[PDB]
Structure formats: structure tokens, C-alpha cells
Amino acid sequence: TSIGKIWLTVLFIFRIMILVVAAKEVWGDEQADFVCNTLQPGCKNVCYDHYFPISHIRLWALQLIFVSTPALLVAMHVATYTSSIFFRVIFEAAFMYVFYVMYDGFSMQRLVKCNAWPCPNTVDCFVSRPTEKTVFTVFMIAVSGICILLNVTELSYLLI
Amino acid sequence: GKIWLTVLFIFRIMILVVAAKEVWGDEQADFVCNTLQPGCKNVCYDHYFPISHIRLWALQLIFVSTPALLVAMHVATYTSSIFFRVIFEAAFMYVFYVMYDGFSMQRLVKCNAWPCPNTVDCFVSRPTEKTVFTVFMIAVSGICILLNVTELSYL
Amino acid sequence: GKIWLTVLFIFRIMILVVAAKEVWGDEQADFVCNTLQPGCKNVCYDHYFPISHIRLWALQLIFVSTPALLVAMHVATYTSSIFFRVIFEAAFMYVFYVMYDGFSMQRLVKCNAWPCPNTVDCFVSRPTEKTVFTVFMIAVSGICILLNVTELSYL
Amino acid sequence: TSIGKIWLTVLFIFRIMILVVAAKEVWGDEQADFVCNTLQPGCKNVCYDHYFPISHIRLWALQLIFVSTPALLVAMHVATYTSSIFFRVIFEAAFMYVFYVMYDGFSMQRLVKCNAWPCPNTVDCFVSRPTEKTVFTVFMIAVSGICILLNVTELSYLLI
Amino acid sequence: TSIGKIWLTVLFIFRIMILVVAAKEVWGDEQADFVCNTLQPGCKNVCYDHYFPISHIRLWALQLIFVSTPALLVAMHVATYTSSIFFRVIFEAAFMYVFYVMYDGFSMQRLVKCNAWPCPNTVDCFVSRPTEKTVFTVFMIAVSGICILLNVTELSYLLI
Amino acid sequence: GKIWLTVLFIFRIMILVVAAKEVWGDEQADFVCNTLQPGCKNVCYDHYFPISHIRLWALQLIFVSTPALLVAMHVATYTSSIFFRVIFEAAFMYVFYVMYDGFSMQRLVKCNAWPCPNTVDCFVSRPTEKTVFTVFMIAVSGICILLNVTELSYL
Amino acid sequence: TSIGKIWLTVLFIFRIMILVVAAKEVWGDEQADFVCNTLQPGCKNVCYDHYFPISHIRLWALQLIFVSTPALLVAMHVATYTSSIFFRVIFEAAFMYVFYVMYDGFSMQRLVKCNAWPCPNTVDCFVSRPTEKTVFTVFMIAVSGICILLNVTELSYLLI
Amino acid sequence: GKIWLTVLFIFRIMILVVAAKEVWGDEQADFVCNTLQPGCKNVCYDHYFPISHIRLWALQLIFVSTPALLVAMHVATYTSSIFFRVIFEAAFMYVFYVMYDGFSMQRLVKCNAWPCPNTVDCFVSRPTEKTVFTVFMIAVSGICILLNVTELSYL
Amino acid sequence: GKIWLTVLFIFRIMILVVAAKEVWGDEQADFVCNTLQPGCKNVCYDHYFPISHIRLWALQLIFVSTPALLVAMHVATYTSSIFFRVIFEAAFMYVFYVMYDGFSMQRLVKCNAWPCPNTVDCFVSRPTEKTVFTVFMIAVSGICILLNVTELSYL
Amino acid sequence: TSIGKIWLTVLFIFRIMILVVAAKEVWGDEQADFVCNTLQPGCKNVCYDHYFPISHIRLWALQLIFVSTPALLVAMHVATYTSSIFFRVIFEAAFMYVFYVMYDGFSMQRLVKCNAWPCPNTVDCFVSRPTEKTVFTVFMIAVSGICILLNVTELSYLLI
Amino acid sequence: TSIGKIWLTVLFIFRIMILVVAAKEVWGDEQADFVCNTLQPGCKNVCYDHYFPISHIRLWALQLIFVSTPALLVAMHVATYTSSIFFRVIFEAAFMYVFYVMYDGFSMQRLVKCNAWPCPNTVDCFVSRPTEKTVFTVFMIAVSGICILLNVTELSYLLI
Amino acid sequence: GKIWLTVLFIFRIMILVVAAKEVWGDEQADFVCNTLQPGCKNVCYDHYFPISHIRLWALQLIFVSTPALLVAMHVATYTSSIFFRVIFEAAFMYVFYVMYDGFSMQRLVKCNAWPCPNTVDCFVSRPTEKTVFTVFMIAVSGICILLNVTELSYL
């Protein structure tokens, strides 16, 4: 109802700044910060790929990428608007579906045990600092849920 | 009033920058756990430093720069935006004092986390600075509260 | 038509940035050769990763942003600039598929290079992502081809 | 006498650029460049905190921060001027007092011997490259002394 | 013939972007990525200085530096033009002469054997990733050859 | 005259940038002292490299870009600003030649500092480049002197 | 039948010399020669104690000790003879019972996987050279079986 | 009686030899203290293993083979030599049980000695054997006591 | 005949002693497997050196000094003791040649055992000697066979 | 009084066996078992030479050597007897004097702090297992004191 | 001339004791004491086998072995004498021939440079303490030369 | 006279045994060269310790127990055997003093051998003892000379 387009940009910018702080001074290169109790070359890297196929940061990076493309299409069409919202919804929903099916959040595995091939046996791989992630997520998740609801609202109003 | 808020805002930003980049840095790497047991250190971190000071304060400025944007958007709630700007800035203090029990920085913590074979001496690096920079980043918050309380109450 | 080209162009740029900076990174350092023989790893790199994906795609965008500049210069050849913009973007795909035999990222390669005393297990790091980001950076190319084929043929 | 406000900005910018070169390609992360002849976890970090409580760079960072706040207050008052100078003096004096009482400059301890608790005994901790600091300081000190005198001058003239 | 001044700037920008990607995500700090089969302090550094006196990146950096100075002189003379080209040619030719006499390209030694003084004997020093250099070069060379020919062309036309 | 000064000024800036960032770098870390005695290397640095070339030249450009700012300030002394601009640029040469005894870069120095148990071989890294870049950064200074001498004398 | 007392001493001496070669130039300090794929202090020692409570060598040492005591008692009684045999049998039988119930021979675990407390997880501990043990055993076992049968024979004859 | 004493004497000697040479060995080296603090291990030894079992038993056989030599010397006190031979052999048991609190061998001890930064896990090696060999070397002592008590009392 | 048997017997003993103590030694420790994978080396031992030469020959002299003791016992079968003394000494040769495929000592073996990540170069130490000492310890056996064949056949 | 010559040989043999067990399975190569909290080549060796100039074992070795020479002289004179005792006393007294002035026993420094030249500073050197030495000593000392008194007794009786 | 059989046994025993001291407290396990400036598994072992095929100690061990067999044969023949000398000569001559052709003595390579296959290149392998070998040899050589001459003398006298 | 020779002979033997086995030991391993250059230490040994004291004295007793055997052989030259027994025992002193410049043991030597990059501090271990044991093993020699001089001269 016209207020929506405000809170969308507010939460958009907010989620962006959070995504920056996350990627920069938290996640970080996590891996390196991924301590595998072992001595078997590739055990750590493979356990990481196994339990962190697509890191949270780059999922969210892609989330904002794809879910800022239709809103850019409209800007070109001017100088389909409802369609760009529909997209802006299902994408932001998709990146959430893949998230929950992958990491089974919102928690953040404190400790993982990997039995990958290089690894001689089941070894204790430690995640690094994961309260300060389980969280950021939360925010990056909640913000997405709201950003859904507002877009669904506008979409529904425009079908009236 | 409105002047000193923006002054201390920019001031706290600059302080926060210097803190994050030079003082704190990647505190972890700069964290020395007397042991040899993979993950004792990292866990003893997430225990004694769940959310680092820098990433609390980043969030502080974020959430406490959000209401001030809503007013600039309505101009195609001000008093409400202040109310928010207060309770957030208060909350980010509450979580701070309940968590770290400041304003002092623990020079040394002893961790008996599960990975750790036993109680081990984990050293923090450069706690004196870190304290100073909290002291500033806290005092500034207290003041920013007060000025918003007088502005809000006056109106 | 012209719109979706620029959209997917900027899109592929952003994808390429995230890839180069966060995903790939300095892949090498993040490359773990089960051995202890100086240069076994590096050689086994230049064998199985002659030109990294990032520095192919950097060149892709370069060469496939060159014809589009000639037209802006003539304005003190357009159809020819498209023709180029196609065959380059096709070439950078040909070299890709002939080289790495994608679209999948080899999880593990076994190198018997000269420095290596024998066949040794060299592990690649994080191939799943890397695959995903290729899949996007390839699909985008296929589309960018098609749209230029319809635009070129139409004219 | 109107020439003062020029040389203030000149020396201000000069000290800034010097502060950059200092922090970036000299001091650096000093610590790391702080070689403690030992093998006792935390001996180096504690000796460092003991003998470098607030590093020179961040003292000076704070110096320019606080001593560019009143000069910003006036810019807001326009769109008290003498008061902003008084502040601009006593602060720049304060950051000098704390400096001399802390590091007893202008020299720069080439070598320090630390008997902190973690350290088993008195150990030789080495500072890293300290001619190329003892100096920069000098400059960052002298510039401050001048920047005092010019502000005291203006302040005194304005009391006439 | 007026088209020249276009393709010069095109190839100039192109070579620049290539020089960036080269220096940043390829060459890199090569050295570090220079594996000397040894254990003798300074053997690697000296073999490097011996076989890579002036790295390719900084040769090319200097190439663009010197070969963008006359074209800047003219911009000052306006607010000698043929002379600035003559320079722009012989310099770009010089940086090629030094290149071929130094590295005997366009190839890129995959492996070098160094018998420098620190080194106890002839040791196998490995260059790091050199298909992905032998190349970039190629480009940075070919572009230079073309950028010569176009400038020689303009120069010759202006002598008519 | 005034033209070639600014040309060579910007030129020397670019040279200085490349030197500081790529050639010199953190020279220290790139400094290999044949020993095992904590602080032998660092001291042998501050002995044979008191003020690195990069941080002399940074200061050179600073002090020799200061007088040229005073004139832009007076415009709400020019000849005096030149005189300064000469004697500084001369001084930064004097300290250079008296200190390092250039223009050559010492390939290898032998340090018998106190931490060092004895005379030890400390290797410098990549002295040939470093020499070249001094040669340019020195020649440029000599020229910048001459042009200011002719401009100053002419007036 | 009088020939027995010969072959007893023959096989006794034979088993002794074999026990020497075993303990000296085979078993050895086995442990040290017990490679636990790990890095967790005490994992190897505990896995060893778990899977080699009483090493083979010292079982056999004790075997010959106890099973040369009655045959010494008789030598004192002279300067009960059947009783000393009965003992000499049941002991040599006992040291075999404990052997088979402990190591489930005659094989010799080439590789053992230990999940002891110090060990972070199930880790691959390697036994060292175990064809050249599985064997010696065999001999030290077979010899015992024969040394039983001969003593049982004499014992039975003397009950007639 | 006199027979079984010499039998069990020679027996306990052989047992003691095997213990000292193969089982115990240089126990220390075979002692694994979860730490990295020079002397934590050694001190935690002298605390939990003041006098090793082998060097108690060596002394046991020494002192309990001394009276039996005096009688062979008088023959150029026998009952007195037995009395001694009893009280010594009893004493070497008393010190054993009061010290180690056997007959079991402590599989694992946790030491908080001064050198140690904290309580650390020190592992003993091969305690099961060591127990067995004590069990024999103790039982033998108990018997050697009894037989001397019956011989002494009988007389 | 009987003389030269005892001569060559004592001779082969001395040779065997020097071999076991100085030449072979603890061959293992003196065994250098180009790898870093716990147990690759040990397994590659038990594969390529199931029963070391020293502990075959120890057994050779044992079993081939057993029949010669039975005759000294019967004297409170001689021809039978020779027959045994032959077939044993023949057997210990058969197992040798079928196992190691001598008389040469493999300078270098390449092991792809399970622990090993791949085929790795395991070096043997000092194979030339070891060969020589086999050559003697084998030739001696061949002769000791022949003399017993002539003595046995003659009778 | 004739009983003396018995208890001398008894205590002589006793002290010998104790000296064996000491040197073999206790002292050992002590050094190696001498843990100097440092990383400075020669600090440990020099601190050892400083605080253990002549190890206890070799003092006692020499003690028995010299104090079994006169008792051997008499055996040659037969195939001066009082003189050989006088020697046998003053020597055994000498080796005790040097002992007490050197190690200030009977205790055994658990921990020593060495500031020798190689050592950068006062460092904590740890002695290895010293209850099980402080002791043996005791015995090797007491036995000497008795062996004195018995020889002094005989000597005095023979002066009557 | 009857004096020969004395000096033979004298020099025999002398050479034996020298051979003991050599093998025990000099040569030693030399290898270990064989420092190859490298880091390439097997380079040291192969260079050793290359330049020390049969170590000096075991050549000499074999020398005394073979050259004490005929002198034992005669002892059996009694309870051919000239033949046993002839052997005793040619053998002791043989072990000298193999020695000089192998090690080209009497010197003792202080330093050897090995280019074996495992070794990446020509590497500096250091022999350990070789004055104190070049020597012992000398003695073990000279003694052999004399022990030849005396046996040749006796042999010649017995051919008269 | 003849008595005290054999006394001091056996005495010097026992001293030599204790020296070789416990004091000196494998001196090398117990030799600490402040460096990291393969073979600097070993060479600096053979320079400052060509023939170790133990292996000089072993030879001393050998050569100075050889003449005393010739006399026992002639008994199926005595004065000549003494003369030899003197000049040898004198020679083994001459080589000692000319070589090591005793009687003191060099606590510390500084080696600039070829392998060594420079002059490096090589520490000797336990020189005080070693001195003492030389002092005895030398004094004994001086006496053994004197007694043979009086015996030889008297005759």
C-alpha cells in the first residue's frame, strides 16, 4: 500500500549491510577457520565441501543478485511490473528452500564428524565461532521472510 | 541537541573503524590458547566471546541508523523513530554488560570446553586498548541515550 | 533484446566477482597435493589447471566487451561488432569444454608429473560451488549467444 | 593573525599523511613484528600489552579524532568559536602528556625485557625497526607542538 | 588515418585490463610461488633475482608509464606532437628489446636450475603456473607490436 | 618548465607506488638472515636499513609537496617556496647517499649485531629491481632540482 | 620311555633360542613399532595396552619361567617327581589357554582399529611386521603342544 | 622350607629382570603427558612415581640378600639374620602400599605440578602388565614372609 | 670332511653375527619410504621383507644344529640326523630363492599397499653389502650340502 | 676387632650394587634428562656443567676406585698395612668433603635457575626425578660414613 | 725363523684391539654420521652405498675371518701347513687389493658429492670425522703389510 | 716398583673405562653447534677434535701394553721393551699437548669451517669432568714414565 516499497528498500539495505559484516568479519574464509582433528591431506577440504557445499555467504550473495534482477528489468522497460514481483518472491523463496534443506537451520552445527574418503576414519571437524553465525543468519532469514510477505501483499493488492 | 548527536555519531563511527581494523582485528588469530588440542581454542572463543565487540557495535550502528532512515523515506513516526533509536541503543548495552561483564576486558580466561583435555590458559591479546575503545564506545552510547531522552521528553 | 543482454552482462559480472574473490580465491594455496616433493603440486596444477576458470572468464568479458567499445568510438561495423561478440564468446566456451571437460569440477586428480616421485593424490577444494558458479557463468553465455544470434539474423 | 589558519591546515594535512605512512608501511601490525625470545604462549602478547598499552598509531588516530571534533562543532553552529580552540589545544596537549608519561619518548625502546606472568622469567623481547619510528614520532610530536603554539597564539590574540 | 587514434585507445585499455588480471590473479607475488628444491637461506631469492631480474609485471608497468608520458606532454603543450609519437614508438620498442634479451620469450621457463652462491649446488627451482603466463605475455607482446605499427603508420603519414 | 615538473612529479609518484606496493613490499618479511636467533634479523635490519627507501621517498614527496600548497593557501612566498622545494629535495638525496652509499642495492650484508651470536649472512631480496627503481627515483630528483634551479635563477 | 627326557630338553633349548631371536630381532620393543594414525597423546599407548595387554614375548618368558620351576624343585628334593610333571603340564597348558583367549592366534592382527578414550575416534593403529611374528609364535606354540604330549605320555606311563 | 625360599628367590629375580628390562624399561620416556611445558612431565613423574617399582624391588632384593651374607662371613646371628630378612621384606611392602596404593597400576594420572600451566592428563604406558608383574613380585614376597615366619617361630 | 663342516659352520656363524649386528641391523629403521602416511612403510616392509634374511638364517642354524644335538643325547639315528641336516638346509634355501629372488638385494621397491595413498618409492639401505653377505651365507650352505651328500652317499 | 673386616666387605658390596642401580636405572645419562626451559644452543649443557660439574655417579665411581687401591697394594706387598687403611680413610673422607661442598646435600635440587652466558637470561632448568636420587645418595653417603668409622676403629685398635 | 710366529700373534691381537676401537668408538654406525645436504628420501642412503659399498670395518672383519680359517684348519689336521700360509697370504693380500681399488686410500674422503637418482642433483654429503679414520686404517693397513711379509718370509724359508 | 706400575696400570684402565663410557660417551652427539648448516658441526669437530681423548688413550694402553707381551712370548729384549714402553708413553703425551694444548678442556670453540656460513659458536659438553679425567689420565702417565726411568736407569 505504497508504504511497502519503503520498508522493502529499508530491509534491503539493512540485509545488505548485515551481509557485508557477515562475509567480512565473521564467516570470513571460514574454511581456514575449520579445524579438522586429523593429519590426512584433503580430509578437511572434503569434509568442508560435504557439510558446506555452498557457503552461507555466497548463497545470500546469489540471493540478492537474482532477487535484484527483475527490479532492474522494470527500470529498463520504463526508459511486466507484477511479473517482476512474482519472480522477486519465488526466487527469495527458493534461496530459502535450498537453505533449510541444506543446513537445516537456523542453528549452526558447532561440531561435525566427517568420514569422507581421504579421512582415515570418522574425524572431529570443528566449525569456527557459530553463535555469531547461527545469528546473522536468523537476521538474514527473518528479513527474507518479511521481504516475502510485503511482496506477496503488494502482489495480492494488485490482483484487486 | 540534533548537532551533538550527529557529531558523536560520526565520532563513534571513526572510533569503531579504528577498533575493528587495527585494535581488535581478527582477534581470534590473535588469541593464544596454551594447548595443542584442535578446536579447544575456537570453542573457548565462542564460549567467552560469542559475539565480538566489533560485530555487536556494527549491529548497534545498523539498528540505530534504521529508524533515522524511515523518516527520510516517509518524506516521499519521528517520535516513534526516536523511541526505537533509544530502546535499541539501550538493548545493545544490556546484552553487552550481561555478556562480558565489562567495562573491563578479561586479560586471561581459563577454558575447560569439551575439546580441551582440561582447564587451559587462553590469553587475550591487548585487552587494555580494547578496554579503552569500549569505554569510549560505551560512554558515547550513554550520552546518545541522554540527549534522545531530553529531546523525546521535551517534545 | 538489447535490455536482457546488458542485464545478463552485469549479472555475469557480479557472479564472476563473487567467484574470483570468495569461491575460487587463490585456488592454488587452496590445493592439497598428498606429497612432500617441491613443485609436484605446482606442476600438477599447470597440468590440470592451465588457465584457471576465473582468468578465462576475465578474458571472456574483456574480449567480449571490446567490439562494443569500437562502436562507441566510431561515434566520434555494428553488425561486425556483433559477429565478433559472438565468435569470441563461442571460442571461450570451446576452450573451456575441450580443456576441463565440464561442466563438472574434478573433485580429485592424480598427478604423475616429473617432480612427483610417483602418481599422487591432489585434492581440489570446494568443487561443488565452483561447479555451480560455472553452470551459471556458462548458461549465461549460451543465452548471450542466442540473443545475439536472433538479433544478428533478424537484421 | 589569519596566516595561522593556513599553517594549521598545512601541518594538519602533513601530519595526516605522515600518520598514514606510519601506520601502513612502518608500525604496521608491529606486534607480529615483536620478537620475544621465548616459547611460552602469551609471553609475547602480555609483554606487548605491558610495554605498548596503546600503540603509537592509535594514540595519534585518537589525537586527530578528538582534535577535529570542535572544529566540526563550529561548522554546525554556523549553518563558542574560542571555546572550540581551547578544546583543540588542551586535547592536543593531553594526547602529548599521555604520550610522554607512557613511552618516555621521543626515543623508541630498541629492546625490552619482560617478566610478565606467563613468561617463565625475564625474557628478551625485541621491538622491530625503531629508528624508523623514533622518527616518525618526532615529526608527529613536533607538528603537535607547533599546532599547539599557533592555536594558543590565535586564542591569545582573540583575548585582546 | 584517424581510425588509428581509436584502435590505439582500444588496445591501450585492453592491455591495461590484461595487465591488471596478470599482476593480480596470476603472476601475483610469484616469488612466494617459486619453489626452490633446497634448504639453504637465500638460494631461492638469489636464483629468483638471477632469472627474474625485473619481473614481467613491472616491466610492463614501466612500459605503460613511460609510454603514456609524451601523450601527456602534448595535453600540456595545448592548454612536438610528432615527437611525442616518435618517443611513444621507441620506448614501446625498447621495453620489447629488453624483454626478449632478458626472458627470451615468448615462452616461460617452466623450470630453472640455479647454481648461485648461497645455493650449495645446482638446485631445481620451480616456476609457478607458466602456461597462464607464457600467454598473458603473448597478448601483452602482440598488443605492443600492433601499437607500434599503428604509431609508425601515423608517423609516416604525417611525413607526407 | 612548469609543465615538465608536474609531468615528472606524477611520473615519480607512479614509480614510487609500483616500488612500494610490488617491488619493495614488506621488504623485511622478504629478508633472509642465515640464523636462528630471535631478533638478529630485525636488528640487522634497523642497522643496514634504518629508513627504507620507500619511506624516505614518501617523505620526499610530502615535504616537497608542502611549499607548493602554501602558495595555494596565500591565494585566499613563491620564490621562497621554490627555495624550500629545492633544499628539501637536495636533503633527501644527501641522506640517501650518505646512508646507503647507492645508487646500487647491497645484494648481501653480514650482520654482527648483539642478538646475533656472530657474523651472519643476511640476504636482501631482489636488489636489481630495487636498484633500477632508485635509479629512476633519483634521476627524476636530479632533473627536478635542475629545472627549479633554472626557474629560480632566471627569475 | 626314556627317549622323552631327551626330546624335552632338545625342544626346550630350541624354543629358548627361538624366544631369544623373537624378543631381540623381531618383536623388539614392538610398541615403538606400533604406528597409530593419530596425533592424540596416549591414543597409541592405550590402544596398545588394549590389544596387547601382555606382549607375546613376556607371556612366553613367564611360560618358561614357571615351567622350569618344578623341574628345579626335584633337583633340590634329591640333593614328588610325578607331581612336578603334572605342574609342568598344567602350567604349559595354562599359558596356552591365556594365549588363545587373548590374541585368538595363531594369526597376528596386521591392523587394529582403536576407539580408546584418549583417541578422538576410531583410529587405524598399525602393527609392525607380523608375518615374522604370526610365525615365530606358531613355532613357540607347536613346541609347547609337543612338550605337553611328551609330559602327558611320561605321566601316563608312570601311572602303570 | 629352605628349598622353597631359594626357589622363589631365583624366581623373583628372573621376574624382576624381565620387568626392569622389557616391561617397565625406561618408563619415563614411555610416559606421555598431554602438554607442552618443559618439566611438567618429569615433575609429575617424581610426584606420582617417586621411586619406581623396579628400583624399590632392586633394593628389596639387596637389603633382603644382605643378612644371608653375614652368616656366610661369620663362617670364617642366623636367627637375627632371619629377623632382619623378615622386617626388611615387610618394610619394602609397607612403603609400596602406602605409596602407590596398589596392587593396581594407575592407568592415568592428572598432574597440576608447578611447571604445569594447569591440570594435565599424563598417561602411563602398559599398566596391565606392570600390574601383573607386581602381583607376582608381591605374592612371592608374602610367601617368603610366611615361610620365614614358620621357620623362625618353629626354632 | 667332518672337519670342513665345523670350519664352515663356525665361519657362517661369524658371518651371520657381523650381518645381524652391523650390516642389516634394524633394517627397518634403516628403511626410507618416500611418503608421509602412517604404516605405509611398515606394511611395505612385511610385504617385500616378510622374514628378514637374518631371522631366516638364525632359524637355519637352529634347525640345522638340532639333529647334531640328538646324537649327543642318544649317547647317554646319525644317518637320519644327516638326512634331516640336509633337507632343512635345502628348505631354508628354497624359501629364500622363492621369496626374495636373490642372490641380489633389491636396491629399490615400489609399494602400493593399502595404507599407502599410491605407489611410493621405498628405498632399501646398503643392498650391496647385504648382497655380499648373502652370497657368502648361501655359498657356504651349498658347500655344506655337498659335503653332507658325499658323506651320506659314501656311507 | 676382626668383625670389622666382615662388615667392610658387606657394606662394600652393598654400596657397589647400589652404585650400579643408581648409575644404570636412575641417574642414567641424567643430562638428556635435564629439561632446560629455553631454545638457546648450549644453555642446557652449560647450566648442567655449572650445577653438575662432576656427576654424582662418577664421583662415587672414583670414590670406590681410589678407595680400593691401597687394599690392593697390600695384596701385592704380601705375595704398610696400617698405612693402606689411613689412605682408605682420608680418601673416603675426601670424596665426602668434595661432595658436600659441591652439591650441599643430602638433598637434590629439584629445580635450578641458570644464567650462563649462552642462555639469554635466567632460565628454568629442571632436574629429572630427584627423590629417587636424593635417596640413593643418602645410602651411598651413610655407607661411606660407616665405612669410615669401622676403618678408624681398626686403625685406633692397631695403635694399642 | 720361529720369531715370526710370535710377532704374527702380537700384531694379530694388536690389529684386533684396534679393529674393536675402530668399529665401536669411531666408525660407529657411520651412516647416521653421514650428513647429506639435502631433503630427498634415499639420497643419503644411496650416496652412502655408492661411496661406501662395503664399509671399512666389515671389510676388515671379513679380513680377519677368512685370514684366521686356514690357521684353524691346521689345528684340526693335527688332532698342508704350508698351504694354510699360502692362503693366509693371498687372502690378506686380496682384502688389501679390494681396499685400495675401492677407497683409494689411505686417505679418507672428507667430503663427497653425490648425483644418485633419488638425489635431485649433485649434493654435498659429508663424511663424519675422518682424520680419526684415515688413521686407524693406516694402522690396519700397515699391520697387514707386515703380517704379509712375515708369512712370505716363513713360506720362503720353508721352501729351502 | 713393578708393583706400583701394575697398580696404576689397572687404575688408569678403570679411569679410562669410566671416561669412555659415561663422561665422554659419544661426545659428538653431545656437541652443540649454534648453526643450521649440514656438516658445519662435524667438520668443526674433526678440526678441534681430530682424535678424541678416549681413542688416543685406548691407543696409549694398546701400544704401551705391546712390549710387555713380547717378553711373555720370548718365554716360549726386556730392557728394550721398557725403552719402547717409555718412548711410546712419552709420544702419546707429546701429541696430546701439541694438539689440544691441555690440560684444560676448551669450554667453547668458534668454527669457521667451509660448510659453516661463518664463524659459529660450537659448545663442548661437560668440559670440567673431561678435564679432571685427563688430569688423572695424564698424571698417571707422568708417574708411569718416572718409575720406568728409575727402573731402566738402575739396571
Author numbering:
A (entry chain A), D (entry chain A), E (entry chain A), G (entry chain A), J (entry chain A), K (entry chain A): 18 to 96, 135 to 215
B (entry chain B), C (entry chain B), F (entry chain B), H (entry chain B), I (entry chain B), L (entry chain B): 21 to 96, 135 to 213
Original paper wording:
Connexins (Cx) are a 21-member family of integral membrane proteins with four transmembrane (TM) domains (M1–M4), two extracellular loops (E1 and E2), a cytoplasmic (CL) M2–M3 loop and cytoplasmic N- and C-terminal domains (NT and CT). Cx monomers assemble as hexameric hemichannels (or connexons) with a central axial pore. Hemichannels from adjacent cells dock to form intercellular, dodecameric gap junction channels (GJCs), which can cluster to form gap junction plaques in the plasma membrane.
The final model consists of residues 19–95 and 134–216 for protomer A and residues 21–95 and 134–213 for protomer B. The Ca2+-bound Cx26 structure was used as a search model for MR to solve the structure of Ca2+-free Cx26 at 3.8 Å resolution (R/Rfree=0.301/0.333). Comparison of the Ca2+-bound and Ca2+-free electron density maps corroborates the identity of the Ca2+ ions: the peaks ascribed to Ca2+ in the Ca2+-bound Cx26 structure were absent in the Ca2+-free Fo–Fc maps. In addition, the Ca2+-bound and Ca2+-free structures are nearly identical (average Cα RMSD=0.4 Å). The most significant structural differences between the Ca2+-bound and Ca2+-free channels occur at the Ca2+-binding sites. In the absence of Ca2+, the E47 side chain swings by >90o and 7 Å away from the Ca2+ coordinating conformation (measured at the Cδ atom) to form an intrasubunit salt bridge with K188, the position of which is essentially invariant between the two structures (compare Fig. 5a,c with b,d). E42 also adopts an alternate conformation in the Ca2+-free structure. The coordinating carboxylate of E42 in the Ca2+-bound structure rotates ∼90° and forms an intrasubunit hydrogen bond with the Nɛ of R75. The carbonyl of G45 moves ∼1 Å closer to E42, resulting in an additional intersubunit van der Waals contact in the absence of Ca2+. Specifically, the Ca2+-free backbone between residues W44 and Q48 shifts an average of 0.8 Å away from the pore centre and slightly towards M1 of the adjacent subunit. The Ca2+-free pore had a distinctly different electrostatic landscape, characterized by a variegated electrostatic surface with a strongly negative potential in the region of the acidic Ca2+-binding residues. In the Ca2+-free simulation, K+ ions rapidly entered the channel and clustered around the Ca2+-binding sites.
